[PDB]
Amino acid sequence: PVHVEDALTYLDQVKIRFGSDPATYNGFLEIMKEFKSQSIDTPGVIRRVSQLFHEHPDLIVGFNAFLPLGYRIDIPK
């Protein structure tokens, strides 16, 4: 159930896993925050995440559970 609870834990999970890397955290917020501004397109949001969590499946997967069939996530080898 993608609700405020699912989004809350996700953030807390991304903060702990990247406790030694604040850059990654700040990057995720930028993508979402940038989207709210209505400037960055969808493909841009999934792209950043797909690159931000290149070595984190549980991350790219957790977010994938939110995106609809329309805008899915890709894993560039």
């Binding site: 993608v2 405020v4 809350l8 979402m32 989207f35 709210k36 969808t42 995106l67 609809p68």
Partner: peptide, 15 residues
């Protein structure tokens, strides 16, 4: 994407 708007909202103000 309503899930994208809720995601940024909780990140910008989730408390």
């Amino acid at each position: 994407a309503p899930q994208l708007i809720m995601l940024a909202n909780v990140a910008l103000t989730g408390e």
